[PDB]
């Protein structure tokens with residue numbers, strides 16, 4: 001093919017969803033590499049000229065990419081589209097960012113359907129020559145995503161409701177916890193350069209000890225040391241790494257949005273003895 005419509009995304013979750021909609025007619029690339037910390041990412045000149053070569057830039061909004069506004073004002077004549085219109089935000093519950101939208105809306109499979117619609121609408125609006133392809137690819141992919149919820153809901157429901165305590169590092173799982181009826185505990189409400197983490201470690205250690213919570217987790221773009229200290233000082237198992245803010249590379253263990261949701265739920269479920 002002569003040349004394909006070029007789409008660039010802020011991070012890897014959006015890249016994979018968008019690439020499933022784009023199929024063979026457009027190439028979708030993430031600005032951030034898999035594994036990069038996305039909230040406070042610092043773009044380089046390489047990143048700017050990459051977005052500058054695109055025909056469309058997709059971003060999450062909802063207070064995720066603190067770096068996006070400054071980055072985008074460096075780009076000339078490239079349209080952007082936020083992919084989260086129509087999602088009901090959940091407010092952050094604790095800390096300095098209390099009350100503002102929790103950005104991690106893709107961790108509810110139901111919300112992924114809205115991500116799909118907004119990305120489809122953006123691709124059709126900006127590359128209308130391939131509307132039928134974007135529309136059919138969005139339809140087929142939405143059907144897959146609709147089918148994601150049922151086995152996960154069933155698996156997690158076998159954990160007695162009173163025992164559903166999800167203890168993580170970043171409070172990045174609020175939308176998944178809402179869907180499947182978990183109560184939330186975390187070492188920091190949202191990724192940021194911040195004081196107070198060693199103090200919250202002790203506070204969470206209390207809550208683990210009081211409620212005899214069996215398991216604690218970290219996440220794949222942040223340090224596992226606080227979660228491992230929590231499990232060391234309590235009885236609780238270190239349940240491993242959850243996947244939320246990044247996919248892996250294409251030959252890694254979490255190459256797709258579908259694998260991210262499925263593997264995060266599997267790891268949570270195994271932590272509770274299924």
Ligand SMILES: [Zn+2]
Pocket residue numbers: 039104170172191244245
């Ligand atoms: Zn995050």
